[PDB]
Amino acid sequence: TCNSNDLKALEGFMRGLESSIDGWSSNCCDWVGISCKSSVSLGVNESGRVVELELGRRKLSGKLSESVAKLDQLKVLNLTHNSLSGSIAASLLNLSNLEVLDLSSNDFSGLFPSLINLPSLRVLNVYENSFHGLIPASLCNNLPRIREIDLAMNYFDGSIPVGIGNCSSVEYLGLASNNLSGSIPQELFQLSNLSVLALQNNRLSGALSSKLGKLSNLGRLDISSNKFSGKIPDVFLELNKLWYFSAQSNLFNGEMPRSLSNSRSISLLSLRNNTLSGQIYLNCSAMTNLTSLDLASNSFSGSIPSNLPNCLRLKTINFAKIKFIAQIPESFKNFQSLTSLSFSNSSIQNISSALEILQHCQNLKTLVLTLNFQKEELPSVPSLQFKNLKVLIIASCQLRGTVPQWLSNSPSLQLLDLSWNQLSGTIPPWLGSLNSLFYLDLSNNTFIGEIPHSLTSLQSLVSKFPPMIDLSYNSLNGSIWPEFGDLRQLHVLNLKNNNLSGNIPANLSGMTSLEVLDLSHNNLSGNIPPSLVKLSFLSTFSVAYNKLSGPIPTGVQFQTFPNSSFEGNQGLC
Numbered sequence: 001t002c003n004s005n006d007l008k009a010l011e012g013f014m015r016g017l018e019s020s021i022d023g024w025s026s027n028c029c030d031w032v033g034i035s036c037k038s039s040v041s042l043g044v045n046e047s048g049r050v051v052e053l054e055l056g057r058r059k060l061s062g063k064l065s066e067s068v069a070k071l072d073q074l075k076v077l078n079l080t081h082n083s084l085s086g087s088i089a090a091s092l093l094n095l096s097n098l099e100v101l102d103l104s105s106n107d108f109s110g111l112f113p114s115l116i117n118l119p120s121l122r123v124l125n126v127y128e129n130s131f132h133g134l135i136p137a138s139l140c141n142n143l144p145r146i147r148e149i150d151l152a153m154n155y156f157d158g159s160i161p162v163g164i165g166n167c168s169s170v171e172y173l174g175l176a177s178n179n180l181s182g183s184i185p186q187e188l189f190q191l192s193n194l195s196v197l198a199l200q201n202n203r204l205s206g207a208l209s210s211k212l213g214k215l216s217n218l219g220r221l222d223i224s225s226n227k228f229s230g231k232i233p234d235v236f237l238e239l240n241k242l243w244y245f246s247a248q249s250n251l252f253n254g255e256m257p258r259s260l261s262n263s264r265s266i267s268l269l270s271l272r273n274n275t276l277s278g279q280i281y282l283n284c285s286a287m288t289n290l291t292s293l294d295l296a297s298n299s300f301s302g303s304i305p306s307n308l309p310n311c312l313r314l315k316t317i318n319f320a321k322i323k324f325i326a327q328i329p330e331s332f333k334n335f336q337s338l339t340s341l342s343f344s345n346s347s348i349q350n351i352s353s354a355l356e357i358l359q360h361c362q363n364l365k366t367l368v369l370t371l372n373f374q375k376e377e378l379p380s381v382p383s384l385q386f387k388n389l390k391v392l393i394i395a396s397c398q399l400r401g402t403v404p405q406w407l408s409n410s411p412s413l414q415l416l417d418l419s420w421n422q423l424s425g426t427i428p429p430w431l432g433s434l435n436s437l438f439y440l441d442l443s444n445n446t447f448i449g450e451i452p453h454s455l456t457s458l459q460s461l462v463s464k465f466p467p468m469i470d471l472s473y474n475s476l477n478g479s480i481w482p483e484f485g486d487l488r489q490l491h492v493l494n495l496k497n498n499n500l501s502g503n504i505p506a507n508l509s510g511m512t513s514l515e516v517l518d519l520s521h522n523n524l525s526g527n528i529p530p531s532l533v534k535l536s537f538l539s540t541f542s543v544a545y546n547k548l549s550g551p552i553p554t555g556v557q558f559q560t561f562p563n564s565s566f567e568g569n570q571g572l573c
């Protein structure tokens with residue numbers, strides 16, 4: 001049997017909402033989202049008390065009534081993922097039985113209540129709201145049972161409070177995605193039970209202290225996207241549980257500390273977009289947990305470290321925007337762990353050698369070679385085989401050649417981007433036979449001849465990065481096959497700046513998911529087929545600069561297209 005004073009409180013709460021909660025019978029202890037425990041359980045009159053109110057993802061809207069603080073036996077309040085807004089009553093943080101507070105993913109704003117007394121609280125979740133001002137200075141002075149604090153994705157600003165050290169039982173502390181600035185207070189390095197520290201996406205600056213070594217339970221540390229500067233402290237011997245470290249996008253300099261090069265624990269390491277100098281060095285017999293390594297966009301000199309294939313767990317590698325001026329070492333022939341490689345804009349030479357070597361990597365799914373090998377010849381040798389390859393991107397390399405047959409040795413290929421090279425010849429009809437291939441970018445080469453009918457037959461675009469065939473800026477001729485209509489999964493078809501001829505097929509609307517359709521700058525005749533009005537998702541369209549004539553379809557999407565996307569045609573009206 002439900003309690004009197006608790007029902008009054010639940011009423012005020014309902015009074016504050018904008019819509020009624022389904023499932024709320026007049027006995028509230030049987031209501032959905034509520035849990036009761038007897039007065040004598042919690043220890044002459046005995047009633048049900050409301051210990052747990054769980055409303056998550058209920059599509060609720062309104063303020064959060066001050067009266068909710070009148071349930072004193074409340075243990076867990078979970079409001080997550082709703083539309084609630086307004087401020088938080090000071091009293092809502094004075095509850096002495098409260099264990100779990102989850103307000104995350106709502107519209108709450110205002111200052112966050114500065115006095116928090118929740119002597120029983122395990123969990124505090126305000127993640128992703130509109131709160132602003134300071135993180136409460138005394139926040140940790142009253143939370144002796146505390147485990148996780150998540151303030152992330154808010155407007156908190158100023159420095160991280162010096163009082164942060166009084167939080168010594170805490171394990172998870174997310175401060176990420178706020179307006180926080182300044183140096184990290186030393187007190188922070190006194191929380192010794194802390195296994196996750198997320199400071200990412202703030203204005204924080206200054207040094208990263210040696211004192212970081214004091215947090216010896218740290219498994220995951222994200223300081224990325226800040227103003228942090230100077231050298232990365234050589235502390236990694238002591239942080240022996242740490243598997244995830246991202247310092248990406250800061251002002252760090254100097255070279256990587258030897259202990260980081262020696263970490264037994266580190267798994268995902270991301271240093272990208274700092275300015276770090278010297279030669280990349282990893283002791284690959286030490287770092288046996290290393291899986292992802294991102295050094296991209298940094299000041300390194302020297303060569304590509306050839307000892308790297310000795311890393312037995314190392315799967316993905318991003319070396320982009322590091323200027324080596326080097327070939328790929330032959331030792332890469334031995335890399336069995338490697339699944340993903342990006343050398344993009346790294347000054348790599350000898351694509352002939354690069355591909356001879358990289359093909360012996362059995363497990364490589366994805367290879368990004370963009371902005372290297374300037375004006376070199378794309379290898380034509382049929383015997384190169386990348387069996388497990390899924391993504392191949394080699395773009396803006398000014399590569400000379402035809403589309404090579406050795407690609408056919410990549411049967412499982414999903415994504416192929418050859419755009420912005422000097423490639424020529426006809427588009428090979430065998431491209432149509434790649435069954436997994438949903439993204440093809442051949443644009444801005446010199447290709448000639450006709451679009452192969454087999455493209456019309458590609459398995460992945462028929463039935464079950466946006467799916468795209470982009471042939472634009474070539475010398476292509478012939479007409480647009482009406483069987484393009486069989487591609488029901490195609491989002492983008494970009495044919496612009498070719499010389500294509502005849503009529504827009506009309507069967508073109510079987511393409512149910514077509515979003516972008518660009519035919520501009522060709523030589524096309526006839527009318528825009530009225531059936532094209534059937535493409536429900538087509539946001540952007542151009543036939544501009546052709547020989548087309550007739551009425552423009554009445555449409556609605558058609559009604560949206562700018563004047564610009566019909567211009568250049570004889571008869572359009």
Ligand SMILES: *[C@@H]1O[C@H](CO)[C@@H](O)[C@H](O)[C@H]1NC(C)=O
Pocket residue numbers: 055056057078080100101102123125
């Ligand atoms: C809040 O409720 C959701 C389900 O609605 C659940 O997944 C989540 O774990 C709850 N939050 C906490 C801190 O228990």
Ligand SMILES: *[C@@H]1O[C@H](CO)[C@@H](O)[C@H](O)[C@H]1NC(C)=O
Pocket residue numbers: 225226227249250251273274
């Ligand atoms: C790289 O890091 C700098 C310095 O923190 C930042 O200003 C910039 O936005 C970052 N750029 C990218 C592409 O992440």
Ligand SMILES: *[C@@H]1O[C@H](CO)[C@@H](O)[C@H](O)[C@H]1NC(C)=O
Pocket residue numbers: 240241242243264265266267289291
């Ligand atoms: C290795 O990394 C994994 C997760 O990728 C982590 O669970 C584990 O703690 C790490 N091993 C060591 C030695 O810390």
Ligand SMILES: *[C@@H]1O[C@H](CO)[C@@H](O)[C@H](O)[C@H]1NC(C)=O
Pocket residue numbers: 262283284285286
């Ligand atoms: C590299 O690692 C091994 C094993 O951890 C170690 O014994 C060796 O001396 C290290 N070499 C360097 C250059 O630090």
Ligand SMILES: *[C@@H]1O[C@H](CO)[C@@H](O)[C@H](O)[C@H]1NC(C)=O
Pocket residue numbers: 321344345371
């Ligand atoms: C390649 O290098 C140039 C010159 O350093 C740089 O400005 C640009 O961001 C890089 N391009 C890409 C897309 O990586």
Ligand SMILES: *[C@@H]1O[C@H](CO)[C@@H](O)[C@H](O)[C@H]1NC(C)=O
Pocket residue numbers: 327350352353
């Ligand atoms: C490409 O790389 C290999 C291996 O070092 C070398 O034999 C060859 O001469 C290079 N090719 C050119 C044209 O520089």
Ligand SMILES: *[C@@H]1O[C@H](CO)[C@@H](O)[C@H](O)[C@H]1NC(C)=O
Pocket residue numbers: 396398420421444473
């Ligand atoms: C085509 O490629 C060149 C460089 O390869 C580039 O400068 C140019 O802007 C590109 N043109 C178009 C239309 O994208």
